[PDB]
Curated annotation (Swiss-Prot), chains B, D, E:
Component of the kinetochore, a multiprotein complex that assembles on centromeric DNA and attaches chromosomes to spindle microtubules, mediating chromosome segregation and sister chromatid segregation during meiosis and mitosis. Component of the inner kinetochore constitutive centromere-associated network (CCAN), which serves as a structural platform for outer kinetochore assembly. It is found in: Nucleus; Chromosome, Centromere; Chromosome, Centromere, Kinetochore. Disulfide bonds: none annotated. This is Inner kinetochore subunit MIF2. It comes from Saccharomyces cerevisiae (strain ATCC 204508 / S288c). It comes from the Eukaryota. Present with 465 molecules/cell in log phase SD medium. The lineage of its organism: Eukaryota, Fungi, Dikarya, Ascomycota, Saccharomycotina. Belongs to the CENP-C/MIF2 family. The gene is MIF2.
Amino acid sequence: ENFALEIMFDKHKEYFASGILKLPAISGQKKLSNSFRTYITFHVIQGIVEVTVCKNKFLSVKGSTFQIPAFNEYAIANRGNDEAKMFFVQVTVS
Amino acid sequence: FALEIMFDKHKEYFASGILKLPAISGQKKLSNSFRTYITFHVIQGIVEVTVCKNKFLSVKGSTFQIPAFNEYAIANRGNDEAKMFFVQVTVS
Amino acid sequence: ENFALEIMFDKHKEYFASGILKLPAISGQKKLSNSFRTYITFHVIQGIVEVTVCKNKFLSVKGSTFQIPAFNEYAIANRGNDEAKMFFVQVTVS
Amino acid sequence: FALEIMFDKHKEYFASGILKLPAISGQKKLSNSFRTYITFHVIQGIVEVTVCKNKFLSVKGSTFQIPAFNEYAIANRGNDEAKMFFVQVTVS
Amino acid sequence: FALEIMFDKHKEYFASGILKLPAISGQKKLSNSFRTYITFHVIQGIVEVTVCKNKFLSVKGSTFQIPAFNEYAIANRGNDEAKMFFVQVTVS
Amino acid sequence: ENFALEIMFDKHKEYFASGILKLPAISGQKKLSNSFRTYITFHVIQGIVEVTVCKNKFLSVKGSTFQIPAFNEYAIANRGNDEAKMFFVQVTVS
């Protein structure tokens, strides 16, 4: 279950691209992916998610914040009732 | 205000944090970003932003950026304290 | 009264883009603009200009030097008799 | 292991060096790149690499990269000592 | 020579300055840029530049660049002192 | 006798471009070139070469390592019997 998303970015006006990632609350809707040539910071605005990066699972809850380095495969699963929402910022590496 | 910045530079690319504005009026911040680009995301509250010429209200779940070498102000314009998550890069 | 200008840049030979900005001496010929995704340094080689950046006016004369950060609206007015000339260097931000 | 890094920052863009693994098993290295991108080129030996999930054998005259903020391991899996030339950039 | 570099790093992206060559022959400079890219603009005088292999005369209102990790020389080849405005970035 | 070469680079997977430069053992096969907007590091895996950069000749043998800064003309001559092989890494400047 792959995904890009869902970017707000006016490269002439502002430095960072950013947006919101939404995960429907079915453990059907866990999301495998890859950062490619960009660094991402996520911030959990709603939900409980389980993150998998390199060789690590961790649980992230509302208010907690995680980062994906460039060229990394990573996954995110929803672990709660509500849909999960993450604000993110990203930069393509230089 | 209350700023706290998290940055373990040997593990992460970005620095991030929470800016809390215990809010009335009060409750408020003046600044200058320096060699720093910042993105703020509003997680609770309604806030008023001044960068450069501009002034806008910015509301829960919205987002704004401050470019390097700009002076900016953030003022709480609501009854509950305002909280923002922010990400930053100190440029070069 | 908007303007780009007027760039010398062989991206395979050299690091910086650069050039010369010329303002005709009519206060008709003041010039609103925006740096977008680039940093500019100006150097007044002839004239007296008034610069407006972010929220600041300043006067610049022959020999004086100013900078525009990226993503900034800025304006330049000629305030003297002669046409005004500025050498500049610029870099698009990373 | 034996690492030696050459970097005269005022003359060169990159840092480089030789990583020697006096090899049996032994003979081996655990790590984390940090704010550093690394490329390794195998000049003598056969080595086993672990970055992230992956594990591969990497043989004389082959080449592999480690991205910043990844933990990696290199183990000698051959009878002669292994030597790698590497180039790195400490990012920003 | 007389160099003076202006750089308030918390307010500006670039460093800049004036290089004065009180000129006869004299009057002259040898160097190496290091981790620095430089642009020079000639505001008064005629000067002779050596970067790498090259040698050229460079005249009032003209412009030349020096790449990082190159040795360069600037010599005054005129009767009045030479002055250059320059901009630089110390790379990474 | 000009040359590019011969690059392995999946820009979405990895940070550096890299490869191997091979010089046939005829002093016919010396190779003038230019780094343009990139920094290169070379590593002599086989041979004896003579490098010319900016204003410098130097001899490089097996195991020795040299660098070309961006925007530089440079040449490489084979000085030995065998064909000469150099591993290299490169980055286009920012």
